[PDB]
Enzyme design. Structure first.
Site, PDB file in Angstrom:
ATOM      1  N   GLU A   1      39.662  41.486  40.811  1.00  0.00           N
ATOM      2  CA  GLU A   1      40.051  40.533  41.837  1.00  0.00           C
ATOM      3  C   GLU A   1      41.559  40.640  42.032  1.00  0.00           C
ATOM      4  OE1 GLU A   1      39.737  36.474  40.390  1.00  0.00           O
ATOM      5  OE2 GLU A   1      39.625  35.650  42.414  1.00  0.00           O
TER       6      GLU A   1
ATOM      7  N   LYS B   1      34.569  35.298  48.491  1.00  0.00           N
ATOM      8  CA  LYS B   1      34.283  34.533  47.275  1.00  0.00           C
ATOM      9  C   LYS B   1      33.709  33.153  47.583  1.00  0.00           C
ATOM     10  CE  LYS B   1      36.655  33.299  42.888  1.00  0.00           C
ATOM     11  NZ  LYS B   1      38.035  33.245  42.322  1.00  0.00           N
TER      12      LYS B   1
ATOM     13  N   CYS C   1      34.970  36.592  39.823  1.00  0.00           N
ATOM     14  CA  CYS C   1      35.611  35.649  38.875  1.00  0.00           C
ATOM     15  C   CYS C   1      34.805  34.505  38.510  1.00  0.00           C
ATOM     16  CB  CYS C   1      37.074  35.242  39.257  1.00  0.00           C
ATOM     17  SG  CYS C   1      38.054  34.819  37.898  1.00  0.00           S
TER      18      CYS C   1
END
Ligand SMILES: C[As](C)(=O)[O-]
Ligand SMILES: C[As](C)(=O)[O-]
Lengths: 301, 304
Positions: free
Chosen positions: B42, B124, B166
């Site tokens: 990321e 995301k 993440c």
């Protein structure tokens, strides 16, 4: 702080002998000031095969009624309340047989200090697995449950209940947390192979995923499932006996951050009890700081 | 019968040009090592000092990506060998976002093929808004706009790829959905904190692996980040007191098999960029799924 006891034991096919062990553990738990004691899957018996299980399941209702009496006896004798979570088997109901479903029920009972059964959770996910280095099929003897178990308002807090294989299906644990669980339990009879690989991992994962205390009562050691009386009555050859099983144990209590705060002592051989004091304020702090349940994407999942 | 993956670990600065150099070297190394796909963490384009900084840097990201696309084709041509690239970047808000009063950046995972074609931009879904235990209060949603789509399964040279970023790792239903859709490999490119990394990084990766019976790839940011940006600090009229930009990432990049065994792991003796390699075994994955057929045993009658 409130005290939990987690029991580790080694069921045989003798329900009378298993009941004696169960009673001693409950007695020990009261003497150690635990408010609830959690015992493993199949604390009434383990069986050689589906035919054996069906035979032994007939004896389970008496086991349960004697256990109910024993709890009220122990509570009154010690002058202290305790609740009991225990895995047992139940035989098929009369209606089940008429519908052609002669399979036994793998059930988790919650019995309060009055000896009243508050919940009968029937196992939802059945262990049908080629265990990596025997081929097991629980659905050959066991019928799957029909319902998600309600949250129990236990002396320790809000309790969500599950059995063994159930732990491998994260959606179940997530649902229990959604319903309000603060504590999850997974009474189990884990194999050595999958236990060595996944037992601690799955327990800690569920705890971290759900921000719940996780209780893991496990069967342990080598079981002797021999039953001369059943073996004689069903006219068995010694060549078709399957009386050896072995379980992982490593019973534990895990905090909502994934920390193992109590663990079975690997050096003690027989039944054993582990204790933990649970902290509601730590649980709340963890949930406040990482508010996962305010952050889910229900719009998509 | 085996397929080679590369997983990159790096330490992003606020300098997109410097970050690109590092990314280019890692992809070059991956091709030389004959990896079929390389996965980068990321925020491989940049990390920022604050939400205003992020928006400023995101304006430079489209150029970064175009230069990267060109670098990939150049590397493929020069080595006479194909590679695909999965990389976390940022993107500026769209005109439609701006009209809706949403000027936040997009935290996106790009999949780029050997021809430099972008096959996917996964935005995301779950944003890191948490009070770190004995640490800072962090609010990703101040700089980043949450995605609105479940990422499609990518038919990569390694097999069926499920993509996440993440904080997405903490929401098991997402990984479960990816497996349901047909994923064989999950990736979680990340910039994980020290406190949560030490606690949960390895736990979460291994858990997702065994939950889903997938290979799990975990490319992580590592080290203390240099977020310095003199020209922007000038433009922003930032005082040296306000200039103290401290951020540290956990690293410990790894590859995990469908049984939860760590099969490759970053060298802890390096705080700079490094590549790790693993050969993924389709037979092992299918064997595990056959022996424990979890996806044939779910209770959709109750959960859903
Ligand atoms: C920089 As673009 C519009 O190719 O994501
Ligand atoms: C523009 As000045 C050097 O007075 O802060």
């Amino acid at each position: 702080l409130k005290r939990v006891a987690v029991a580790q034991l080694c069921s045989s096919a003798d329900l009378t002998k298993n009941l004696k062990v169960v009673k001693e553990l409950i007695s020990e738990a009261i003497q150690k000031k635990a408010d609830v004691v959690f015992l493993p899957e199949a604390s009434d018996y383990l069986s050689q095969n589906p035919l054996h299980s069906r035979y032994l399941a007939q004896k389970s209702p008496k086991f349960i009624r004697q256990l109910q009496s024993s709890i009220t006896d122990l509570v009154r004798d010690n002058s202290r309340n305790i609740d009991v979570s225990i895995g047992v088997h139940l035989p098929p109901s009369e209606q089940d047989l008429l519908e052609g479903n002669d399979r036994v029920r793998n059930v988790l009972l919650y019995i309060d200090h009055e000896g009243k059964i508050l919940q009968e959770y029937q196992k939802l996910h059945l262990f049908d697995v080629d265990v990596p280095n025997p081929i097991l099929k629980e659905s050959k003897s066991v019928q799957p449950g029909k319902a998600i178990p309600d949250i129990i308002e236990s002396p320790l807090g809000k309790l969500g209940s599950a059995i063994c294989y159930d732990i491998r299906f994260p959606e179940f644990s997530l649902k229990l947390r959604s319903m309000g669980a603060e504590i999850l339990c997974f009474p189990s009879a884990f194999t050595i192979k999958t236990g060595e690989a996944h037992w601690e991992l799955l327990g800690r994962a569920r705890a971290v995923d759900t921000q719940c205390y996780v209780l893991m009562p496990g069967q342990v050691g080598m079981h002797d499932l021999s039953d001369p009386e059943w073996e004689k009555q069903s006219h068995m050859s010694a060549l078709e006996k399957s009386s050896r099983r072995e379980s992982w144990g490593h019973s534990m209590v895990i905090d909502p951050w994934g920390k193992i705060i109590a663990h079975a002592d690997p050096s003690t051989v027989g039944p054993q009890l582990i204790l933990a004091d649970l902290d509601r304020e730590l649980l709340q702090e963890i949930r406040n700081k990482m508010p996962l349940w305010n952050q889910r994407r229900d719009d998509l999942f």
